[PDB]
Design an enzyme around this catalytic site. Structure first.
Site, PDB file in Angstrom:
ATOM      1  N   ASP A  24       0.767  -1.265   0.000  1.00 49.89           N
ATOM      2  CA  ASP A  24       0.000   0.000   0.000  1.00 49.89           C
ATOM      3  C   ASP A  24       0.785   1.294   0.000  1.00 49.89           C
ATOM      4  OD1 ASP A  24      -2.683  -1.551   1.785  1.00 49.89           O
ATOM      5  OD2 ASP A  24      -2.637  -1.182  -0.213  1.00 49.89           O
ATOM      6  N   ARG A  35       0.744   6.741   0.437  1.00 55.75           N
ATOM      7  CA  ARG A  35      -0.260   5.694   0.626  1.00 55.75           C
ATOM      8  C   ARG A  35      -1.141   5.713  -0.619  1.00 55.75           C
ATOM      9  NH1 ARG A  35      -3.929   2.380   0.927  1.00 55.75           N
ATOM     10  NH2 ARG A  35      -4.494   1.286   2.882  1.00 55.75           N
ATOM     11  N   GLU A  73      -2.586  -7.830   4.817  1.00 56.30           N
ATOM     12  CA  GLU A  73      -1.278  -7.656   5.471  1.00 56.30           C
ATOM     13  C   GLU A  73      -0.387  -8.877   5.088  1.00 56.30           C
ATOM     14  OE1 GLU A  73      -0.525  -4.770   7.226  1.00 56.30           O
ATOM     15  OE2 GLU A  73      -2.475  -4.203   6.493  1.00 56.30           O
ATOM     16  N   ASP A 114      -7.133  -1.304  -0.001  1.00 54.95           N
ATOM     17  CA  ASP A 114      -6.633  -1.929   1.158  1.00 54.95           C
ATOM     18  C   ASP A 114      -6.160  -3.312   0.839  1.00 54.95           C
ATOM     19  OD1 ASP A 114      -6.081  -1.862   3.955  1.00 54.95           O
ATOM     20  OD2 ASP A 114      -7.684  -3.352   4.070  1.00 54.95           O
ATOM     21  N   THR A 115      -4.924  -3.598   1.174  1.00 53.59           N
ATOM     22  CA  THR A 115      -4.261  -4.834   0.747  1.00 53.59           C
ATOM     23  C   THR A 115      -4.182  -5.787   1.946  1.00 53.59           C
ATOM     24  OG1 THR A 115      -3.010  -3.510  -0.890  1.00 53.59           O
ATOM     25  CG2 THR A 115      -2.120  -5.737  -0.266  1.00 53.59           C
ATOM     26  N   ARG A 122       1.382  10.667   5.399  1.00 57.16           N
ATOM     27  CA  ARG A 122       1.646  10.066   4.092  1.00 57.16           C
ATOM     28  C   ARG A 122       0.964  10.843   2.987  1.00 57.16           C
ATOM     29  NH1 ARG A 122      -0.039   3.975   5.668  1.00 57.16           N
ATOM     30  NH2 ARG A 122      -1.989   5.213   5.776  1.00 57.16           N
TER      31      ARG A 122
HETATM   32  C1  LIG Z   1      -6.174   5.078   1.925  1.00 57.23           C
HETATM   33  C2  LIG Z   1      -6.232   5.999   3.137  1.00 57.23           C
HETATM   34  C3  LIG Z   1      -5.789   5.608   4.346  1.00 57.23           C
HETATM   35  N1  LIG Z   1      -5.872   6.519   5.334  1.00 57.23           N
HETATM   36  C4  LIG Z   1      -5.544   6.172   6.642  1.00 57.23           C
HETATM   37  C5  LIG Z   1      -6.902   5.798   7.252  1.00 57.23           C
HETATM   38  C6  LIG Z   1      -6.542   4.651   8.104  1.00 57.23           C
HETATM   39  O1  LIG Z   1      -6.243   5.163   9.391  1.00 57.23           O
HETATM   40  P1  LIG Z   1      -7.134   4.771  10.624  1.00 57.23           P
HETATM   41  O2  LIG Z   1      -7.173   3.263  10.669  1.00 57.23           O
HETATM   42  O3  LIG Z   1      -6.422   5.441  11.771  1.00 57.23           O
HETATM   43  O4  LIG Z   1      -8.370   5.528  10.223  1.00 57.23           O
HETATM   44  C7  LIG Z   1      -5.214   4.143   7.564  1.00 57.23           C
HETATM   45  C8  LIG Z   1      -5.272   2.904   6.796  1.00 57.23           C
HETATM   46  O5  LIG Z   1      -3.968   2.882   6.253  1.00 57.23           O
HETATM   47  P2  LIG Z   1      -3.192   1.553   6.271  1.00 57.23           P
HETATM   48  O6  LIG Z   1      -4.162   0.574   5.555  1.00 57.23           O
HETATM   49  O7  LIG Z   1      -1.910   1.864   5.522  1.00 57.23           O
HETATM   50  O8  LIG Z   1      -2.966   1.204   7.675  1.00 57.23           O
HETATM   51  O9  LIG Z   1      -4.727   5.077   6.637  1.00 57.23           O
HETATM   52  C9  LIG Z   1      -6.484   7.807   5.224  1.00 57.23           C
HETATM   53  O10 LIG Z   1      -6.564   8.598   6.209  1.00 57.23           O
HETATM   54  N2  LIG Z   1      -6.937   8.242   4.052  1.00 57.23           N
HETATM   55  C10 LIG Z   1      -6.835   7.389   3.044  1.00 57.23           C
HETATM   56  O11 LIG Z   1      -7.273   7.783   1.999  1.00 57.23           O
END
Ligand SMILES: Cc1cn([C@H]2C[C@H](OP(=O)(O)O)[C@@H](COP(=O)(O)O)O2)c(=O)[nH]c1=O
Length: 129
Positions: free
Chosen positions: A15, A29, A37, A34-35, A75
């Site tokens: 991701d 990011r 883990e 969502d991939t 990110r």
């Molecule tokens: C794709 C994406 C992830 N994120 C944040 C939300 C999620 O945080 P929360 O779980 O704290 O809300 C997290 C998921 O990323 P990861 O899947 O890299 O962990 O990344 C965003 O804030 N906006 C986005 O567009």
């Protein structure tokens, strides 16, 4: 939207990608995906697919959406293209990611990605098998 060049520093995982963007290192990011883990089923495959699509490409581009350009973790939030092919879309097309985290403001490619996910799911491909 518009596509900007960037240089690859590190393909990190399914991701995120570290790129040199206008001279500065940043972690991006991938929007809308969502991939699984690494230690979950399809994790290693899903990660290697993403990495190699990026690493094998001559040209890497970043495309910000219309909303926020950085997430709550610092990110960059973008669509990433590898020789003109959207990485976010391909992961989903191949059943190695799911459409996720679809917020207002940053949803330009939502329909396109849902189309890809619907094809993957119809084919019962990988995570959908
Ligand atoms: C794709 C994406 C992830 N994120 C944040 C939300 C999620 O945080 P929360 O779980 O704290 O809300 C997290 C998921 O990323 P990861 O899947 O890299 O962990 O990344 C965003 O804030 N906006 C986005 O567009």
């Amino acid at each position: 939207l518009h596509k900007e060049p960037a240089t690859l520093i590190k393909a990190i995982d399914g991701d995120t990608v570290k790129l040199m963007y206008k001279g500065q290192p940043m972690t991006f990011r991938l929007l809308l995906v969502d991939t699984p883990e690494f230690n979950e089923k399809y994790g290693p495959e899903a990660s290697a697919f993403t990495k190699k699509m990026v690493e094998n490409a001559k040209k890497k581009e970043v495309e910000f959406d219309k909303g926020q350009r950085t997430d709550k973790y610092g990110r960059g939030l973008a669509y990433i293209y590898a020789d003109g092919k959207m990485v976010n879309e391909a992961k989903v097309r191949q059943g190695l990611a799911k459409v996720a985290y679809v917020y207002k403001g940053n949803n330009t490619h939502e329909q396109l990605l849902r189309k890809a996910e619907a094809q993957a799911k119809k084919e019962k491909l990988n995570i959908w098998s």
